[PDB]
Amino acid sequence: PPLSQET
Amino acid sequence: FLSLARFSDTQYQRIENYMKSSEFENKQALLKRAKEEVGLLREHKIQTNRYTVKVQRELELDELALRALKEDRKRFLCKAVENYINCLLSGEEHDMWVFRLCSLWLENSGVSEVNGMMKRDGMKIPTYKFLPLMYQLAARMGTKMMGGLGFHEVLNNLISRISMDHPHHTLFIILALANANRDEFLTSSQLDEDRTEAANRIICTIRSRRPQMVRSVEALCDAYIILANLDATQWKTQRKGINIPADQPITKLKNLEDVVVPTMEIKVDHTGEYGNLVTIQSFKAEFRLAGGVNLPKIIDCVGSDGKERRQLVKGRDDLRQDAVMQQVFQMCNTLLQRNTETRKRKLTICTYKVVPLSQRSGVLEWCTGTVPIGEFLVNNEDGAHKRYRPNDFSAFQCQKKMMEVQKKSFEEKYEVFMDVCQNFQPVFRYFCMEKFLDPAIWFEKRLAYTRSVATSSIVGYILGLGDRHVQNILINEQSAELVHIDLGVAFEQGKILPTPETVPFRLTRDIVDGMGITGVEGVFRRCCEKTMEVMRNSQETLLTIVEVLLYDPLFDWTMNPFNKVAERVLMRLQEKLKGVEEGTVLSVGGQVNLLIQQAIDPKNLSRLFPGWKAWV
Amino acid sequence: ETAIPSSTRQAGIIQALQNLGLCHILSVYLKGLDYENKDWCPELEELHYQAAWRNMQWDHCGTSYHESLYNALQSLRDREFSTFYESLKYARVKEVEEMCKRSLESVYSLYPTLSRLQAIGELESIGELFSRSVTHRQLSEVYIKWQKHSQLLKDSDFSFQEPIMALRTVILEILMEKEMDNSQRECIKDILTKHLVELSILARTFKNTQLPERAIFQIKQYNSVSCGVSEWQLEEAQVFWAKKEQSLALSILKQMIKKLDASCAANNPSLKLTYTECLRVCGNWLAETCLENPAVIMQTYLEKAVEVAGNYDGESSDELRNGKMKAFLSLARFSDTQYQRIENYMKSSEFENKQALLKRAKEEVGLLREHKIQTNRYTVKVQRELELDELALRALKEDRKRFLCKAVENYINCLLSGEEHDMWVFRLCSLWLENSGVSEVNGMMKRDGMKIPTYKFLPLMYQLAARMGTKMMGGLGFHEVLNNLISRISMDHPH
Amino acid sequence: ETAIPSSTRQAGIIQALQNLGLCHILSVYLKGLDYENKDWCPELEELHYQAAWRNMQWDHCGTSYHESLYNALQSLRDREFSTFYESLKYARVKEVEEMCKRSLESVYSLYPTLSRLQAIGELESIGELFSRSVTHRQLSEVYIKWQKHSQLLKDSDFSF
Ligand SMILES: Nc1ncnc2c1ncn2[C@@H]1O[C@H](COP(=O)(O)OP(=O)(O)NP(=O)(O)O)[C@@H](O)[C@H]1O
Ligand SMILES: [Mg+2]
């Protein structure tokens, strides 16, 4: 899972 | 000269603030009412009684006072600029006032007297004192500040002379400004067109004297632009490395003698000739993907000395914000070094060079000798938490709980967060224990880590940095100083995200535990107070650095048809620096305590994004 | 500086050391003076006996006033009232004749003599009490007499009051030293603690921090801490606050609050009033230093003190009503200050610029909604920042209204049954008149403030009499309540 | 406060008086200490000799660093250089051996020793200058050397 809160 | 200049600048600022206050507006409205009433009393034949004479006389006194105030303000502005010129003509220890001189000159470009005096006496000022503010000067060629053609021509001449004297710190900036639409050309208002034309005039003027250097630098820039615009979506499944296709000019671009690597800072001297700088020798034939939706490209360049230097070509992204962030980072580091209170404490900010190349693309320096915090702490294979506390909940279990609770309410989120923190103890305190066996080195590294954390957190709060998860923070394996690398979103952008950022900076349990037994109290609090005092004592310099906006707005703003959000962020930054907020004055100690309370509050940590790893 | 002659240089040094709270250092320095200089001049001999009796240096062996006082103290410690009375009579005669031999003509010269005679009279009263026995009633009546006379000395100088307090402290220490173990010893210890705390406030109001610290040291020397903290911990916190040790004072007072709210159990009304005082002091300190936002400190300390004082006011004592009035005044002043700060911020140019930016955002969102445009990242960001700005403005307006209501209500409560706080009627009337458009404040004024005595509005009677104009259209309720209040005031005081 | 033991309470009082600019008051207070207390501990004896040489109290009569410094100053005032040089050599040896006997490991502990050694070296330079005669050029070059080294000591602490 991506760490940053993309958009 | 410095004392006279400072007094004149202070008086001019005081007068300007008084003129911008609401009291001045009320006085002006009353004066306008008096003017219109006198005009009515003069158009209509009315005998002059006691009231008429009193109104006329008080109007005359008010007009005289306003005229005297305006003349005195102009004479203070002229004295301040003249004494700044005199101090900087043959001075070296007072070189930090060039920012105040440029702010005064640029904010009052409409006055022809100051422009003429600048072009008459200040024309002989050495060109190496404007390098930190070179970008600010390069962002002032727009015609929105209509102060006559004299200001534009003197600014262009000064920029041309600076570029001729120091092409290394100027050519990249001018070409980046002139390459706003280069991505679209290789694959826009009147202000943008005028700035582009001025940049093209600067480029051709420089290339008249240094044709080979200019054409080589622009060739390298175009190679970087096309490499950034290269589509690597078919290589997303490859991590070992992909060979760059031979059609790219970067592969055939080798053996540059007049081109200096952009990602490495250059120690500028007082001489206009450089002959001991590392140049570009060759480029590696393989590049790696760093992950993410944008798929950044990592390339390695070989210098003249043969040492490989890693670079990150972040395509389809605007690095101008990161360049501003790095410029203000350098300003903060310089101010901390200048102050004797923080110089003893050795408060420094870890910075990496960022070189924008276009509006939608650019390059930045890769940080070596650092390891991600998350990779060290919550690694699935050999994580610190798994190694030290096997009985505690695993990172996968915490992620599963956070995924399952994001659809619940506030009470459930808080309860699960408290339970997770109950069954997840900090382990980050063993980094220096397991990497520095000597107690003296262990404490020196821990103290450096605490000071770096405090300074970075304070600057991040001031700049509104919100994307601070485990992958955006890098810790050095030798100095144990945290480095901020992402800088992707800032200026209070986390609130715009669907999950608001309720903390100003990352002060999680691992960070607090790694600071020592004393925790936040002690070194962290005192360093935060010192940094806040230093920032509050140089608000003019900080605003001058941040005021580069409103003239060349970056991408993602002013789309979908004095910028709106750029003025909003300037207002917010000024409020943070002054510590006024909604009219409430806060001391440096109170502000630091409030920030610590907000950062360490489990209530604020519960609502944060699950991928931010608040518990970690 | 060594150019000053040693005749007065040593006297100045000794006086400075005495006023700096240094006793053992002065004693050693004077011993060094005795070592290096053999003969003693009358001035330094008098200062030697003054420091001897003040420091209780009983080892050290016409006569001056200080010599007579020390001899009388030693005779009292030796149970010899014949020489105690002879020494006091000789001291009185010497002081009277010395005072009257000069040309006089100055009132200020009488104060040192009056202070010395007062100290002699107090020592005479103590000798009379200590002649045969000591009882709780006699100690209580002596202490209340001392407190009443010290009240008569509020306007006197600290230079003329310090010897009286020092002698009282020495007397109480002698009584503690020569008291057999019984219930009387506890009463004497409590009296000594009360005397030391009154000396602490007396020296604090005169910008002195050394003597109050010495008094607190003696308090810690005799009294001991327990589960229930006494009233002298608050005075210690106040002393540390006056010593610019804000962090230590706040930590001590917060620890006191943590102990009191956890082990109060309504054990003592004195503990209740000192809990209210501690909460009020903590709230004032937080408000002044601004280490926390007013939102949490107000609720945690001010309303807590108000409800604590108001929930147990069944005795209606003066020592409880004055504390309730002080808590009401502190809450009212904090609410008024916050309301004024908010109003000034709203009237600043920055607020106008923010409002203009908000209006631009509103009109651009309206254009983006009237015209069908897909929602990109810019539109979402603009909408969200607009929502946050609107929420912040609404919260600020509601908070300002709640501060206005709290300030007016607490002014009403303070003025309902208060006399020493009658100077705040001008602030109450300014707040009420400048906010006549709000019906809530007018209704609360006509509901609770209608019973306020009418003699407190006379200085501002003209101001009220000039407010019947209709230019301040705030409804007919404000006009009718103003007319009724003016009519009642005129009926009560037609002159 | 009187709960603090007199071993360090007197040292703290003397240090506070030294840092408060009080010299004659400290001298009289220390005389009162000598009167009330007969025997002298090494710490208070060292502070006694420090105040003796700092206040130029030449009337007052192994040896500590301050005792050696005062003895060297008195020998210089008596035009005796043999004992002056022997005392400085003994002080240097004592300071070096005392500094090196401990566990070290801290840079901050080196500063007091470096300051004491610098003071000894400056006294050696003064003795060499005052050995036979004094000239304007020698005094000027001594002062400029002192000023240059004080420029090198700008970042040093005021305690050192
Ligand atoms: N200067 C740097 N040194 C080392 N690693 C870096 C540096 N800059 C970025 N990285 C890493 O490279 C990867 C991508 O960089 P990043 O700037 O985070 O890109 P991004 O696509 O905008 N990602 P994000 O915003 O985090 O979703 C991440 O793993 C970063 O940790
Ligand atoms: Mg990132």
Numbering used by the authors:
A (entry chain E): 12 to 18
B (entry chain A): 2387 to 2573, 2591 to 2964, 3002 to 3056
C (entry chain B): 2052 to 2112, 2121 to 2554
D (entry chain A): 2052 to 2112, 2121 to 2219
Text from the published report:
Ataxia-telangiectasia mutated (ATM) is a master kinase regulating DNA damage response that is activated by DNA double-strand breaks. ATM belongs to the phosphatidylinositol-3 kinase–related kinase (PIKK) superfamily, whose members share a common domain architecture. ATM is directly activated by oxidative stress in vitro and in cells. Overall, ATM emerges as a key cellular sensor of oxidative stress, initiating a signaling cascade to respond to and alleviate deleterious oxidative damage.
(A) ATM H2O2-activated state cryo-EM map for a locally refined dimeric C-terminal region that includes the FATKIN (light and deep pink), which was resolved to 3.0 Å, superimposed on the map for the whole dimer (translucent). The activated conformation of ATM shows a substantial rearrangement of the FATKIN domains compared to the basal state. The major movement involves helices fα21 and fα22 (residues 2377 to 2476), referred to as the FLAP-BE [FLAP-binding element, where FLAP stands for FATC, LBE (kα4b-kα4c, residues 2793 to 2828), activation loop, and PRD]. Upon H2O2 activation, the fα21 helix of the FLAP-BE tilts downward and shifts inward, while the fα22 helix kinks inward to form elbows centered on residues S2407 that nearly touch each other. Interactions between the PRD and FLAP-BE′ helices are drastically altered as the PRD path completely changes in the activated state compared to the basal state: Instead of the PRD occupying the substrate binding site, as it does in the basal state, the PRD moves behind the FLAP-BE′ helices in the activated state (right, light green). The combined protomer rotation and PRD displacement exposes the substrate binding site, with residues from the LBE, catalytic loop, activation loop, and FATC becoming freely available to interact with the p53 substrate peptide (right). There was no density for substrate peptide in the basal state particles in the H2O2-treated sample, but in the population of the activated ATM dimers (in the same sample), we observed additional density in the active site for the 12-residue p53 peptide (p5311–22). Seven of the twelve p53 peptide residues (12-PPLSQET-18) were visible. The phospho-acceptor site in the peptide is a serine (Ser15 of the full-length p53 sequence), and the hydroxyl group is positioned by Asp2870 and His2872 from the catalytic loop. In the H2O2-activated state, a platform consisting of the LBE, catalytic loop, activation loop, and FATC is exposed, on which the substrate binds and presents its phospho-acceptor site to the adjacent adenylyl-imidodiphosphate (AMP-PNP).
